[PDB]
RNA sequence: CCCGGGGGCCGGGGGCGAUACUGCCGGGCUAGGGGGCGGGAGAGGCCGCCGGUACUCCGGGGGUAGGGGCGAAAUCCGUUAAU
């Protein structure tokens, strides 16, 4: 008997956030971030930070009764980075090793169908 | 240098001629141009109605305490429940 849930992974260039919830996504069983598992702010987007956060969220979900999960990885969608950051792969790898039953792995980064004006002006981030 | 003769001194007018070229007058054409008909092409324009995701904000439910940012941080957001 497999109780199903969803692992949302937010992999940005500065941090990662793993939220494990029920299959409707309304009930949250666990939620970990890189700042909750890493000493300094410089290591939040580290694959180590994503790996240990995925471990902690997985043990919490297994302890609270979730044994199977789909995976939805994402980055900051719209006027930002349209790809998951550097910790999504490590997070899913730690999820797989934690003993949780994997369903479907999908990218759910929100895509603007046009858009809004992004930051940094018109000369870019360095001029 | 002076004398004598011819030429020019770029022009005006008169007379007699020529009609290729330009102009004028008349007639006729279709080669350029314009006006058409037909089937298509186009982010051409104005006007009206509608949608797509993204986004921000707001209200409620889940769930704690971080989030955001950077080369590193810090200001900043958050325990009136944030991400
Ligand atoms: Mg003489
Ligand atoms: Mg004279
Ligand atoms: Mg003289």
Q: Which bases in strand B are touched by protein, i.e. have an atom under 7 Å from a CB?
A: 51-55, 61-63, 65-74, 83
By DSSP bridging, strand A101-107 and strand A16-22 are unpaired
Q: What is the resolution of this structure in A?
A: 2.4
Cβ < 7 Å from nucleic strand B? A 10, 12-15, 17, 19, 21, 26-28, 31, 33-36, 40-42, 44, 76-79, 110-116
Main-chain dihedrals φ then ψ at residue A64, nearest 5 degrees: -90, -5
Contacts (Cβ under 8 Å, ≥6 apart) of A61: A5, A7, A20, A29, A30, A69, A100
A93 is written with which tokens?
């790898």
A2-11 as b/e: b if 16+ CB within 10 A = eeebbbbbbb
How long is chain A?
Answer: 127
Experimental technique behind these coordinates: cryo-EM
């Amino acid at each position: 008997k497999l109780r199903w849930g969803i692992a949302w992974i937010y992999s940005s260039s500065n941090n990662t956030i793993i939220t494990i919830t029920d299959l409707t996504g309304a009930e949250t069983v666990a939620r970990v971030s890189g700042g909750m598992v890493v000493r300094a702010d410089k290591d939040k987007p580290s694959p180590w930070a994503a790996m240990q956060a995925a471990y902690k969220a997985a043990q919490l979900a297994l302890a609270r009764g979730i044994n199977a999960v789909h995976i939805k990885v994402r980055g900051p969608g719209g006027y930002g980075m349209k790809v998951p950051g550097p910790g999504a792969s490590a997070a899913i790898r730690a999820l797989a090793r934690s003993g949780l039953v994997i369903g479907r792995i999908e990218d759910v980064t929100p895509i603007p169908h046009x858009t809004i004006r992004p930051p940094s002006g018109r000369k870019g981030r360095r001029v």
